[PDB]
């Protein structure tokens, strides 16, 4: 089962999407593409050996999505990422059910279209949100409050 | 024709839920229960209707939610699966409200579950098939009715009431019951010419439920209304196959030998 | 001669599909189940022919794919193996439409498999050897049946009667049974000549299943379908590695002290 | 019973074929040797913590093979490794019945020795190998096919 990106989506988000869509582990994956470990390090974030070609286009034989659109998951050169706190704009949630690796750049702290403060944990429960990998369904996983009525509470 | 021969059979298929003093009085009962956050446990037979009695406990307190606050469910109803464990319930919990969970420990599960349960308002907790889950989460649904109070309705086959004693405090906290009946009498009658009237759907041709359907009926499901159901149903399906109009006495017949 | 005898003996020991009214009643009944998703469960003795009529109706209704969506696979047959758990039942669900399985917890397995069970638009679930998983897992196909409104069909011997009726929900749920015949009688007679003519497929030497050949087959086989298979199959292999054309009286009797 | 290692024999492969001979389960050794459940640890490739001095020593006196030449069943210094998969160059296993630690360094593809890539699954029926360790008999656990004859289907 092939999935399409949505716009700005993250790597570590798309990945874990596929890996749904197709019942795969990251292990898997990483068989699947022959790049191993190196699937799950990308999902927590993880790129102390950037992303070379290789694994690129070994993950793009996989997913069907060329190596240059997977790189539009990942912040263009120059542009610093945190891989921690994870963060979210419910509203852009609530329009396209993605993290966008924009939320992860260093220098952002608003949302532009939106233009509210982006969320760095969830604001009913302060429960940190999980890799994106990880976001399953589009809730919190302690209070299940769902990321498009956090909305309703970003400043 | 073929078209309409097609709607009435999916028609068929597909159950519905007609209002009878069963459902009357669980929901009577669950609205007093509710109203005092007492936590109870409905009990009965099998194949005798009450997972349908609280699912429309469940849907007639529909939640109405506010424009930007979350909405407000009073009745939360779970039917957890076999060997349903701590973690399995929570993640339903928290996704009944509509709260996708997040990976993590069994206290991450728990923390969000409590969060989102104190947040929803919720009144009701309406554990059906409550004879499934593990004895290490009655400690968690105990906790639950415990702080966050809410009136807890364990809800399963009479193997439940067993399940239950084996414990200490589930038994003692779940007490009150509500035991479903076996509705046979001239309510059963009732109810027989009820569901010709309204599930069959089928034109009047003065069936009105005789002596002798009632005798075969009264054989064949044994009070159960499930049982009533799948024969009405089985009997009208075959009638309209082989093109009569009506139900006959033969399709009563073998239908009720296939069964028993 | 010696390649055409290879044939000979390598079509004998193939076993082949013979039509006849205890499969048309099955499948008949099984149509008839799936077109109102009625959940029951077809029972019978020993050897005496359900897995095939069973292999048939889904052979029958062979999928067909779309060009670019998943295969719909109307009738699923699943036969789990001894002491079946539900991850291995899960397993075998999705396996059988195709899906590879991907490692995980029970919890994933079972999301999947209900995923690519509503995907395929699924209508029957046949499990035959029905008495050998686990009851564990009839909590599972009874929620699979309660919620994705699928007929489930419980195949095997008499054995699993009893294994279903100490249990409450799923005796009750699934009670609708086609018993399978012992077949004896005329009947019995049109089926070995009706086996002679087509599965035998030997030249033909007039036969035609004389009294005492009949009287042999009745006092071996006592009824039974694969009793008949193989002691037709054995005496024709006999009687063709010995050199002779025709099936003679002393294979029959040679045979037929054999099994008693 | 003590045990000759083979040359570049894994430490999984060497303690598991310890506790063959000596009928011992990896606690067994570990409560011999009085470091209880690193023995496991170890077994399955596991070294966040990297095996001490203490530790090797404390191994080295119950199977009697110096420390020296238990650091030689594990990469040296700045070779990196991978716990997963497990992998095999059937040729070699044909000649040598052990698994080599080379197999798990990240760098290596190819035997030298036989110039043939080498496995990571049976390549009959693509059952994983499990952990050195537990190698009791030379074949795979699934189809049990001889690793030797594995070396037939190496490309
Ligand atoms: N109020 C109702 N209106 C219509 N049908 C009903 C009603 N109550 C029960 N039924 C019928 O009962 C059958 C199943 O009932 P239900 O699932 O509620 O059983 P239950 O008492 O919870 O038992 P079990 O634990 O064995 O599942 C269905 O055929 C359903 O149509
Ligand atoms: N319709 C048929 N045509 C040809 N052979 C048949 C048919 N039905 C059954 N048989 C024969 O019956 C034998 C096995 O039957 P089958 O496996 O269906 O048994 P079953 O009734 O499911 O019993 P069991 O549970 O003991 O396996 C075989 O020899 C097979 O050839
Ligand atoms: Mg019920
Ligand atoms: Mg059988
Ligand atoms: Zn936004
Ligand atoms: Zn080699």
Request: proline share 5%.
């Given at each position: 089962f092939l999935i399409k990106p949505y716009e700005g989506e993250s790597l570590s988000h798309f990945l874990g999407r596929f890996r749904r869509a197709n019942h795969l582990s990251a292990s898997g994956?990483?068989?699947?593409?022959?790049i191993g470990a190196i699937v799950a390090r990308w999902e927590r974030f993880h790129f102390n050996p950037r992303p070379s070609q290789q694994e690129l286009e070994a993950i793009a034989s996989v997913v069907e999505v060329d190596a240059q659109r997977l790189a539009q998951m990942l912040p263009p050169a120059g542009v610093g990422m945190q891989h921690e706190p994870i963060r979210l704009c419910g509203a852009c949630y609530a329009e396209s059910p993605c993290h966008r690796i924009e939320w992860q750049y260093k220098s952002v702290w608003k949302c532009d279209r939106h233009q509210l403060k982006i969320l760095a944990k969830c604001p009913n429960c302060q429960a940190p949100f999980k890799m994106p990998a990880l976001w399953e369904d589009g809730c919190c996983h302690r209070c299940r409050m769902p990321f498009a009525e956090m909305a309703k509470l970003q400043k | 024709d073929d078209e309409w021969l097609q709607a009435e059979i999916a028609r068929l298929k597909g159950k519905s839920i007609v209002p009878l003093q069963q459902v009357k009085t669980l929901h009577d009962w669950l609205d007093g229960k509710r109203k005092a956050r007492k936590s109870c446990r409905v009990v009965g037979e099998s194949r005798t209707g009450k997972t349908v009695a609280?699912?429309?406990?469940?849907?007639?307190?529909?939640?109405?939610?506010?424009?930007?606050?979350?909405?407000?469910?009073?009745?939360?109803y779970i039917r957890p699966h076999?060997?349903?464990?701590?973690?399995?319930?929570?993640?339903?919990?928290?996704?009944?409200?509509?709260?996708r969970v997040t990976k993590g420990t069994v206290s991450d599960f728990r923390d969000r579950t409590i969060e989102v349960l104190k947040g929803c308002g919720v009144e009701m907790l309406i554990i059906d098939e409550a004879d499934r889950l593990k004895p290490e989460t009655f400690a968690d649904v105990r906790d639950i009715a415990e702080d966050l109070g809410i009136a807890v309705v364990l809800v399963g086959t009479d193997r439940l009431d067993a399940v239950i004693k084996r414990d200490e405090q589930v038994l003692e906290r779940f007490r009150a019951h509500l035991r479903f009946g076996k509705l046979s009498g001239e309510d059963f009658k009732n109810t027989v010419e009820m569901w010709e009237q309204m599930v069959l759907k089928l034109p009047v041709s003065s069936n009105l439920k005789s002596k002798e359907m009632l005798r075969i009926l009264t054989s064949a499901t044994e009070g159960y209304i499930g049982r009533l159901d799948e024969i009405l149903r089985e009997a009208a399906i075959r009638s309209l196959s082989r093109g009569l109009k009506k139900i006959d006495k033969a399709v009563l017949q073998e239908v009720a030998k296939e069964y028993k």
């Amino acid at each position: 089962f092939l999935i399409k990106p949505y716009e700005g989506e993250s790597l570590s988000h798309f990945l874990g999407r596929f890996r749904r869509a197709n019942h795969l582990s990251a292990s898997g994956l990483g068989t699947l593409a022959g790049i191993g470990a190196i699937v799950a390090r990308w999902e927590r974030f993880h790129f102390n050996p950037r992303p070379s070609q290789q694994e690129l286009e070994a993950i793009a034989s996989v997913v069907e999505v060329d190596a240059q659109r997977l790189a539009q998951m990942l912040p263009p050169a120059g542009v610093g990422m945190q891989h921690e706190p994870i963060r979210l704009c419910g509203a852009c949630y609530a329009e396209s059910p993605c993290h966008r690796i924009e939320w992860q750049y260093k220098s952002v702290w608003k949302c532009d279209r939106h233009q509210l403060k982006i969320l760095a944990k969830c604001p009913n429960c302060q429960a940190p949100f999980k890799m994106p990998a990880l976001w399953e369904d589009g809730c919190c996983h302690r209070c299940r409050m769902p990321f498009a009525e956090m909305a309703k509470l970003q400043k | 024709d073929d078209e309409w021969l097609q709607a009435e059979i999916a028609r068929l298929k597909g159950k519905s839920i007609v209002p009878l003093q069963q459902v009357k009085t669980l929901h009577d009962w669950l609205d007093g229960k509710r109203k005092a956050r007492k936590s109870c446990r409905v009990v009965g037979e099998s194949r005798t209707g009450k997972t349908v009695a609280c699912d429309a406990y469940r849907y007639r307190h529909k939640p109405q939610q506010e424009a930007g606050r979350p909405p407000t469910v009073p009745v939360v109803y779970i039917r957890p699966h076999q060997k349903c464990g701590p973690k399995d319930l929570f993640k339903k919990i928290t996704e009944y409200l509509k709260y996708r969970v997040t990976k993590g420990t069994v206290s991450d599960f728990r923390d969000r579950t409590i969060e989102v349960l104190k947040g929803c308002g919720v009144e009701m907790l309406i554990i059906d098939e409550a004879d499934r889950l593990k004895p290490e989460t009655f400690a968690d649904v105990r906790d639950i009715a415990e702080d966050l109070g809410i009136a807890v309705v364990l809800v399963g086959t009479d193997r439940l009431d067993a399940v239950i004693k084996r414990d200490e405090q589930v038994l003692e906290r779940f007490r009150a019951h509500l035991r479903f009946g076996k509705l046979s009498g001239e309510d059963f009658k009732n109810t027989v010419e009820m569901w010709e009237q309204m599930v069959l759907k089928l034109p009047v041709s003065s069936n009105l439920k005789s002596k002798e359907m009632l005798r075969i009926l009264t054989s064949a499901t044994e009070g159960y209304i499930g049982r009533l159901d799948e024969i009405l149903r089985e009997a009208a399906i075959r009638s309209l196959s082989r093109g009569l109009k009506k139900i006959d006495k033969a399709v009563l017949q073998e239908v009720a030998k296939e069964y028993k």
